[PDB]
Amino acid sequence: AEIPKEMLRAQTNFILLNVLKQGDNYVYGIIKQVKEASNGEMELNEATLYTIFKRLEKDGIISSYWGDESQGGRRKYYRLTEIGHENMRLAFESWSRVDKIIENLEANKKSEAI
Amino acid sequence: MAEIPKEMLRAQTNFILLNVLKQGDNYVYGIIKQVKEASNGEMELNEATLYTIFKRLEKDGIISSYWGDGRRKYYRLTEIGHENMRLAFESWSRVDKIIENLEANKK
Numbered sequence: 001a002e003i004p005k006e007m008l009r010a011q012t013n014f015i016l017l018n019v020l021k022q023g024d025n026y027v028y029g030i031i032k033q034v035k036e037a038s039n040g041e042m043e044l045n046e047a048t049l050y051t052i053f054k055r056l057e058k059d060g061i062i063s064s065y066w067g068d069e070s071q072g073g074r075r076k077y078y079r080l081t082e083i084g085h086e087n088m089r090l091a092f093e094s095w096s097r098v099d100k101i102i103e104n105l106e107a108n109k110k111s112e113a114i
Numbered sequence: 115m116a117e118i119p120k121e122m123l124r125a126q127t128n129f130i131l132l133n134v135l136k137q138g139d140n141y142v143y144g145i146i147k148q149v150k151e152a153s154n155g156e157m158e159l160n161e162a163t164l165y166t167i168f169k170r171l172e173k174d175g176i177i178s179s180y181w182g183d184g185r186r187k188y189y190r191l192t193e194i195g196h197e198n199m200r201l202a203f204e205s206w207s208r209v210d211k212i213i214e215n216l217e218a219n220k221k
Binding site for chain 2: 011083094095102
C-alpha cells in the first residue's frame with residue numbers, strides 16, 4: 001500500500017498551482033514556502049518543479065518572465081495565466097461532479113438496501 | 115488549453131470506480147449501470163475504458179476478480195486497495211493543510 005506515483009504528481013501540481021494563485025514566484029522560493037507551509041515535511045525536488053512547469057507552460061496554464069535584472073540578476077519568475085485560473089475552476093467543478101456521483105452511488109445503495 | 119487534461123480525467127474515473135468497489139463487490143455491467151443512475155443517466159461509461167483501468171488496478175493488487183455462481187465476473191477492492199484509499203485521503207488532507215497555510219501567509 002502506497003500513494004501511487006501518479007497521485008503524488010497530481011498533489012504536487014495542485015500545490016504549485018495554488019502557490020502561483022497566491023502570487024508570482026520563483027522555483028527556490030516556492031520550494032522554501034512549501035517546506036514552511038508543511039512544517040518541514042514536504043521538501044519538493046527542484047527537478048520535479050522543472051518538469052511540471054515545462055508541461056504547464058506548454059499548456060498555457062502558467063507563463064514566465066525575467067526578474068531582478070535591475071539588481072544585476074536574471075531570475076525566472078512564474079505566473080498563473082487567465083487560462084490557468086479557468087483550469088483551476090474547471091478542476092474544482094469537475095471534482096465536485098465526481099463527488100456528487102459518488103454521493104449518489106452511496107445514497108442509491110442505502111435506498112436499495114432498504 | 116484550460117480543459118481538464120487526460121491525466122486528471124483518468125484520476126476522476128479511477129476514483130469513481132474505486133468508490134463503487136469500496137461500496138461493494140460488483141461486475142462490470144452492474145458498475146456501469148450504477149454509475150449511469152448516479153449521474154442522472156448522463157455518464158454511461160464505455161466498457162473498454164473500464165477494462166483499461168482495471169488492468170492497471172489488478173496488476174497493482176488494488177482489485178481482484180472472482181466468479182459468481184452464465185456466471186458473472188465480480189471485482190473486489192483488496193485489503194491493499196482499502197488501505198490505499200485511506201492513505202490517499204490522508205495525503206490529500208495534508209495537501210489541503212499546506213494550501214491553508216500558504217493562504218494564511220498571503221493574508
